[PDB]
Every structure is written in structure tokens, then in C-alpha cells.
Amino acid sequence: NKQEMGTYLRFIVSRMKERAIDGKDSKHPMYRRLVHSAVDVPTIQEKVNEGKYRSYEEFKADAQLLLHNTVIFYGADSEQADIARMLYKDTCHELDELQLCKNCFYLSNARPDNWFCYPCIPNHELVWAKMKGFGFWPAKVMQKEDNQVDVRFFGHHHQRAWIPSENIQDITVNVHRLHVKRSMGWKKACDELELHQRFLREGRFWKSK
Ligand SMILES: [Zn+2]
């Protein structure tokens, strides 16, 4: 876990680092004056590297505190607050995604060749799903509730979307039957689906080092 925490947090901080520049920063003389506890991205990045976070909750609390200071120092209605709010949301979203499936999260960030084809445990349910404007594309189910399913599509972008349950078909349905445009992109996604299914059958699990 401690090794995993390190690499996962590094992925998140790296992503949080850029949308954090735009930049005139919380180093006014009044920063001392309005802000209780000090923190910035470099401090967080150091704490990640030195293994200072005991849990993801402690990391999240530092991200929250950074948001709180920005709000206090610039005002809740300020544009700096808007940006910092989006930063915090994005950070917490990554933590959500990590919790959803650690293996998906690692592969999605590290992106080795054919990253989306490696199996997870438990295996993700596979479906055909259509979005408004599109025909059916193959996808992995990440989670679901009664009236909708959270999927990540095969192919370009590997688009993440909520799909109404009525727009889902079992992966065992015959492709030729239902509606979709057989574009090059769609065929590429179907190839990726098949390669994923082959890796599953092979027991070809992702191996680091
Ligand atoms: Zn997964």
C-alpha cells in the first residue's frame, strides 16, 4: 500500500500541478494575517515524495486546506476561488477513480501498450452502450445503479460516461444486429475489445518492473 500510495499520489499531484499555475500567489503579507494553516502544491508534492501521508484522507485534507486558504485570502466569490474549487474537485475526482478500481487507475495513468486491455479483479462487466448522437460502442462497466450505468468506452479518448440502462446491451448480442456507424474509430474500439477479451482468456495480467 505504501508503495502504491506513493505512485498513485504522484500521478495525482502531477496532474494537479499544471492547472494550478493559471498565478500571483498566496504570499502577500496578509497571508499570515487571514490564513491559519499554510500549504501550497510544492509542499504537498514534497510530502508525497517523503512519504509523509499516512492515508489518502490526509492527502485530501491538505488539498482541502489549500482550497480553504485560497477562499479566505481572495474571497469566496473571487476568480481564484473558482479555479481553486475546480482544482480541488479534480483532485478528489482522481481519488474517487482510484477507489473505483486501483488497477484501472494505474493503467489509465501509466499507459503501457494496450493498457485498457489488461484484466482487473474482479473482471469488469462488458457492454454495448449508445450515447445520444452515437450508435453502440463497446465499454467496461465501472459501477451502476438501477437506472444508469457508469462506463468507460473502448477506443479513442476512452470516453467516460453515464448511460441510461435502456441504452445498454449485453456484450453477447450479435454486433451485426444493432445500430452503429462502422467507422474506422468504431472498428478500432472493437479490435481493442477483442484484445481485452483475449487477455482475459489468457490470464495475461499487467506486470510491472
Ligand atoms: Zn479495473
Curated annotation (Swiss-Prot):
Instruction: Give the disulfide map.
Output: none
The source's domain of life comes to Eukaryota
Q: Where is it localised?
A: Nucleus; Chromosome
Could you describe the post-translational modifications of this protein? Ubiquitinated, leading to proteasomal degradation.
What, per the annotation, is the impact of changing residue 94 to A? Impaired H3.3K36me3 binding
Oligomeric state and partners?
Homooligomer; forms homooligomers via its C-terminus. Interacts with histone H3.3 trimethylated at 'Lys-36' (H3.3K36me3). Interacts (via MYND-type zinc finger) with NCOR1. Interacts (via MYND-type zinc finger) with MGA protein (via PXLXP motif). Interacts (via MYND-type zinc finger) with EZH2. Interacts with EMSY and E2F6. Interacts with PIAS1 and UBE2I.
The record's note on its domains? The PWWP domain specifically recognizes and binds histone H3.3 trimethylated at 'Lys-36' (H3.3K36me3) and adopts a five-bladed beta-barrel fold with an extended C-terminal alpha-helix, with a conserved H3.3K36me3-binding aromatic cage formed by Phe-134 and Trp-137 of the beta1-beta2 loop and Phe-153 of the beta3-beta4 loop. Specific recognition of H3.3 histone is mediated by the encapsulation of the H3.3-specific 'Ser 31' residue in a composite pocket formed by the tandem bromo-PWWP domains.
According to UniProt, the name of this protein is Zinc finger MYND domain-containing protein 11
Instruction: Tell me the gene name.
Output: Zmynd11
Part of the whole protein covered? 154 to 366 of 602
